[PDB]
Amino acid sequence: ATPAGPPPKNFRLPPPKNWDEESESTIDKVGKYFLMTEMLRGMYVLLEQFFRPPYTIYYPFEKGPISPRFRGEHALRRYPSGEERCIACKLCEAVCPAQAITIEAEERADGSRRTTRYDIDMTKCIYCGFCQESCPVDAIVESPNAEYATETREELLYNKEKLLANGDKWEPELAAAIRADAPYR
């Protein structure tokens, strides 16, 4: 219970003090009992809080702080041209910790390598952000949007038509968060 070698210098406790060896005057000792002085001090600390500013935020008018690295709902982005950035490498499908991504790809009419299916089970996803660390083209991101509770969980099966619609909606904020964090990525 103590380490090997010599016992620690004064590890052993002093002998216990008898009641009449204690250094506390009866006046101090009896007063603290009947006046309940330590409980009075704690009640006074609550008066101090009473007259301090509160911590509360009025939501939804005032929001809490979120960093550029925040991990909210997924979005599929484009280039300035308008083409989808996604080229169907499937890296985000391989690294998914919860197997939430299902991708089916083929050759587009023009010969380009593009996805035909892009589904994200929002009820399987753990919001780790791994999908967006593995992208070679910044195609999949997680927007700062955390406010999308829905009614049915069928609404939480995002298909490629919803994830592109999300990127079109959120692009300025997505481009801004990428601009802030890119040096660190």
Binding site: P97, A98, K124
Partner: peptide, 9 residues
């Protein structure tokens, strides 16, 4: 949460 919604991780 994801766990109650659909099982999650």
């Amino acid at each position: 949460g994801s766990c109650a919604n659909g099982g999650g991780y």
